[PDB]
Paper text:
Genes encoded by these organellar genomes are transcribed by their own transcriptional machineries and translated by the unique ribosomes present in these organelles. Unlike the mitoribosome, which mainly synthesizes hydrophobic membrane proteins2139, the chloro-ribosome synthesizes both soluble and membrane proteins1040. The overall composition of the chloro-ribosome is similar to the E. coli 70S but differences occur. Compared to the E. coli 70S, two of the LSU proteins (bL25 and uL30) are absent and six new plastid-specific ribosomal proteins (PSRPs) are added: four in the SSU and two in the LSU3140.
Author numbering:
A (entry chain d): 91 to 147
B (entry chain E): 23 to 269
C (entry chain b): 2 to 47
D (entry chain g): 79 to 121
Write the structure that this text describes.
Amino acid sequence: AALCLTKRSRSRKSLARTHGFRLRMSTTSGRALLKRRRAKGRKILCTKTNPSSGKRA
Amino acid sequence: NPRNNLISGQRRCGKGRNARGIITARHRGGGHKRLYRKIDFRRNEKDIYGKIVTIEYDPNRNAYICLIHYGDGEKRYILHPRGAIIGDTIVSGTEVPIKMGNALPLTDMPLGTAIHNIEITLGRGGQLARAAGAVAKLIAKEGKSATLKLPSGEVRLISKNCSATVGQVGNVGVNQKRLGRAGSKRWLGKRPVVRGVVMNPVDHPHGGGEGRAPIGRKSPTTPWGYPALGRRSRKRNKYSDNFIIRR
Amino acid sequence: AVPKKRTSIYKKRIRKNIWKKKGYWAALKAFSLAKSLSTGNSKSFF
Amino acid sequence: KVEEANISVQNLPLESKLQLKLEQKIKMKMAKKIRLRRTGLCA
RNA sequence: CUAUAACGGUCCUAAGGUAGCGAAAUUCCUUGUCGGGUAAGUUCCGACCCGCACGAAAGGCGUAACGAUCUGGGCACUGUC
RNA sequence: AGUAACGCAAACAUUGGUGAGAAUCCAAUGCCCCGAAAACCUAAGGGUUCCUCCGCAAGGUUCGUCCACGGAGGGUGAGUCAGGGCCUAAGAUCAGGCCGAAAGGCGUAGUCGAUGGACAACAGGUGAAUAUUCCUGUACUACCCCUUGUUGGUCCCGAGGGACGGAGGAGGCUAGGUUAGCCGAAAGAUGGUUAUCGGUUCAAGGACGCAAGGUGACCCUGGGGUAAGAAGGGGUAGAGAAAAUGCCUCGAGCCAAUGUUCGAGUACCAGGCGCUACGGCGCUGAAGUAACCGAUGCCAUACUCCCAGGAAAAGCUCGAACGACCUUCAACAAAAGGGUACCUGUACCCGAAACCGACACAGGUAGGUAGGUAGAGAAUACCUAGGGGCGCGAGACAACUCUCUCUAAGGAACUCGGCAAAAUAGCCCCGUAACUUCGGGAGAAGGGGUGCCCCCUCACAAAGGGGGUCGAAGUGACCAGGCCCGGGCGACUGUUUACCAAAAACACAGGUCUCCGCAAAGUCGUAAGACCAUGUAUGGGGGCUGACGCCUGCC
RNA sequence: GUGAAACUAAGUGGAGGUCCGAACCGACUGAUGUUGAAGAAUCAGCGGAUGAGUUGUGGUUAGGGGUGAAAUGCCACUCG
RNA sequence: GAGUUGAAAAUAAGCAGAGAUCCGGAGAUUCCCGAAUAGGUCAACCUUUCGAACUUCUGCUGAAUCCAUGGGCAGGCAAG
C-alpha cells in the first residue's frame, strides 16, 4: 500500500481530458474559468499534453 | 453452437445501477457478460410449422428458451412450455390446434385451459405470465374481454382480441434450487443488501441506539420513510379493467 | 529535555574558551613533532 | 537464457502478434493448397 | 412433624409470561450456597434458585465443522522468573 | 552546541596513477554482496538527467580532481516495431426532436473514444551518445508501369465470417540446461594426477511437409477386406448469399506445432602470429555432432467437465431492384517482372540518486526473460550472466538502549494474562478417539526409521530387504505444524473504523411479512424522461431474523 | 445381489467461496521507531492465496450530494 | 534634418542630401491555437476532394389526399 500520496504516474492524455483546454472550454462554467485565469493574467492557464511531443527543451 | 446470428450481443452496459450515474436501483453489479438473446414474443408468423431443435439455456431469463426453425429460412427463440420435447412442431395462427406451445388469438380457444404468455394489448410482444413455470387459466369469456386469471391468484378481464400461447412455460424445477455457497448470489449479480437497523440515523429511519435497537418508529419504513407494511400503493384511477385483486 | 533559558554571554565565552584552548594544548605537541622532524636521526616519516 | 531470447524479438504482445501472423499466413497457404487439391480430385 | 403451598379470595388491566434457559456478554446485594478442579482459586466447569431487571424471528434452546475471537486447566519447552 | 546526527549490521583492502591538494576520482590485483536480483528490456511518468571537453562559488549531510551541480558544444534517422491515416466496447458529444427562469437537462442517426479487433522484417555488423531505424544479405505488404484476355464497374445494399468463459489433467513437441563424443589449449612450481579449460552458433522468410489426437464408425487388434456419411465440394426444391428440404459426390482422410532443404558452399568462432602512446587492430582460424530430462512458450477458442452460459464494428469471402457508371475513365489469372513507399514516438532513468512520497527519503510503481548444485517449488542456501561494496571515517573499547547467541539447578515460581522466547517440524511406516449434519473430526493423538558403503530382488526408472562403517548428534546448515481437555459468542469462507478498535460488529445461503398486473410498486429529475426491465408474479421493491434440529405462547 | 431398484469394494473422474505454501493482497501479536530512515515504517512472526480474489488502461456517480458486506467510514494527506 | 540597422558593445557588411534613422494620415501582409469556422482534437495538432451551422437570396420542390404546403437539395452571397 502506497503512502498517502495523491498523484500517481497517470497518463498525460488521461489528465488532459479531465482538465484539458478543449474540455475546459465546452462547459459554460469552464469558459468562465478562462475568463478569470485571463483577468488575473496567468500564462500557463491549463495542464495539457499535445499529440505530437509535449515538450520543447 | 452459439452465435445464432440472434444472440444480438450488445446489451445496456452491465446491470443498470444508473439512470444518471446514481444508484437508482440498489445493489446490482458483478457477474458475467450475460449476453442476451432476442427471443420472440410478437410471435406473429402465422400458419407456418416450425420445428424445435434446442432447449437452450437463457441466462437473461428464468425459463429455458427453445429454438424453432421454419419451412422458410427462419429461426426464433421462444419460451418452451412444459413438455416440449425436442423435435416437435408448434404453429401460431388463428384456428390452430389447441396443443402445447402454439399461439392463437384469445377469442378462439376453450375456457379453462392453461395459457402462459399473453398480450395486455395488441402489438406489444407478450406481457403476462412469462416467467419459468407461470400459468394463467381462462375464466369465462365475454363481449370484448376475457376474465383471465393470471398467476398471482388474481382475476382480470383482458381484451379478447389479443394473442396468447397455450400450455405453461416449463422448467418449474428452478423454483426450489438452493444456492448454498452464499456467493452464488454474487455470481448472479445481486450485491448484498445490508439490513437497516444498523445504518446510522442519517442513513435510514432506524437510527442506531446503544445495543441492538428495535425500530421504535410507529411503523417500519422504507429507507425513504414511507410505511413498509400493508400500505397499498396503487394510483386511485388508472384502468380498473381487473375484476378482483385476489391478493 | 528542553532547556529552560538561554545562557549568558559570560558562560558561553567560558566554554568556547575551553573548546579553543583544548585546541591550544594540542599544538605544542605538533610543534614538538616539527622541531624533531627537522632533519635528525629518527625511525618515522619515511 | 535471456539475450538469446531477445535476439529473436518476440515478447509480451509481439510474441502474440507475430505468432498470430504465422498462424494466419500458413492458413492462407493451406487455403490455396486445398482449394487447388479439390480440382486435384474432381477433374 | 414443623416448614415450603398441589389449591384457593380479593383490586387490576387487554391480558397477565407458555416451552426452554437461568446468579448467565443479563443477579445489584455478591468473593450467593453446594460439588469438582488447585497446597490455597473473588477467575473456571456442573448444579440449586428469592430471574434487583432472562424468554420465544429487537427470536428460545442445542449444536458437528471453522475462529490472527474472549475464556479456564493441561503435557513438552524454555532467562519469563 | 560545536551538542544529537551524518539515513540500515553487503566490506572493504592494497599497489600505481591524476593533481597544489586523495580513504572519497581512474586502472589493476584481491576480498566481498545480490542473482525471481542490488541484472537486461518495456508501458506510464520525467523532460535534457544521455555523450564529449572545461569548471568548481552554492548543491553532495565528509572530501573532491568527481558528479545526475555550473558553462560550451553535441545527440535520439522506421513502408514492417507503437500510435494516427482502419474499426468499434464502457463512456463522451449528439444535428434535427422533446423538456426547462437563463445557463442547460433527457434523447436518435451520426462523430470521437482503446486498455480490444484488421494489418508487412529478421540475422550480423558499426559506433562518444541511435539502431527490428544506418550498412550488408535475404524477406514481406500496399499502389502504379508492361502483356494476354473477359468488357463489364465501384457504391449503397442482403449474407457468411471476424466472434471471443472458466477450470482440468492428459498428449505430442520445441526453446534450455546437462552427459557424451569432436576440435583447441594447458604443468597451473606441496602427495598423486588431466579424471582438468574453452568452442561445439545461425533468425525471419520461401518450397515440400507428417507421426500424434479427432471416424471409438460393425469387433479381434489396433493394418486387407465391402456399402451411405468426417474436414473440403456439386447441387436442385420456396430465384444471388447464406437460413431451412432431400439426393448425391474413385470420400475417406482432413487439423497443427515440430521435420527437410534453401536462407547460411556463409558468416560466426576458441585458439594462433605482430603492432601498441600497454585499449586496439591486423592475418589465420579447427570441430561445428548425438543421448537425457524438461517446460509456468507452441498445436490450443485440441479435448472433457462444469453453470454462473462468456463485446462489438470494421477489414475479408460469396450475390438479388444483375442499382448511379459502362473495356475512355474497369477489374481480375497474370509475368509473383521493374520502380515507388505518409505523419508522430525512438536519447537517458524505468524492482529507479533522476517517476510518485517536499531531500541523492532503510517506502511505493503494470508487463516481459528466467541459468547451475540441493530442493516438490518462481521458497530457501551457495554461485554463473550481469551489476554493485550502499557516499562520513579512524580509534578505543565503561555504564546503558537496541539486533542477537549461550546460560549451571529448577521449568510459569514472573505476570493483568506462559504475552514474548524456547520447543516441534520433511519423506516414508504403524495407529488414530470423543463426537457428526455422518462430508468431517484427522496431519487427531501417539510411536518408529531415515548418514555413507556393499548386495539382489519388487517396477526390475524409484523405493524396500540383508549386511557393514562412522559421529555425541544422520531431513543432521538453510527451509520446515506445538498439541490436548473444557467453556461463551458467531453457523462457515468473507468484509469493516486509509493513521490507537478485525470483533461476538456487517454480510451472507435460508425464513417469514408486505407492496407491485406491465404504459408495476420503488428511486432520481420541477420537466422531458432514465433505472427498474430490453425483465414480466417461482419475477421486482421494501422491513425484521440470519446454516441445521425441535419450536415459535398469551394480549 | 431386486420383473425394478435400493447399497458394498475397486478403478477412472476431477469438484471444492477445500487443504499446506511462494508472487500478490491485507493487516493480527511483539519489539524498534516516536525532534523516526518513514506525516503509521523496519524486523521476527501472521491471515487469504481459483475466489464474495487481485491488478493494469480508459470511464461513471458529488457537497446537505456521491458511495458505502454499515464504521458516519471514504470522497485526492481535510470530513457529524 | 542628419547620420543610422530596437535593450546592452562589438560583431558583419549595408543605407542615406540623386532625404537614410525618425515622426504622422491612409494602406498591404498578418504562419498556428483561440467565436474558430474543411472534418476530428488531448489547444497552438492530425486527415483533408481546400471549403462551418444560423439568417437571407435564387433555383429542386418529400409525406399523405399529383393538392396547397413545411421539411431536403443545391448554387448564393457575408450579416448574428
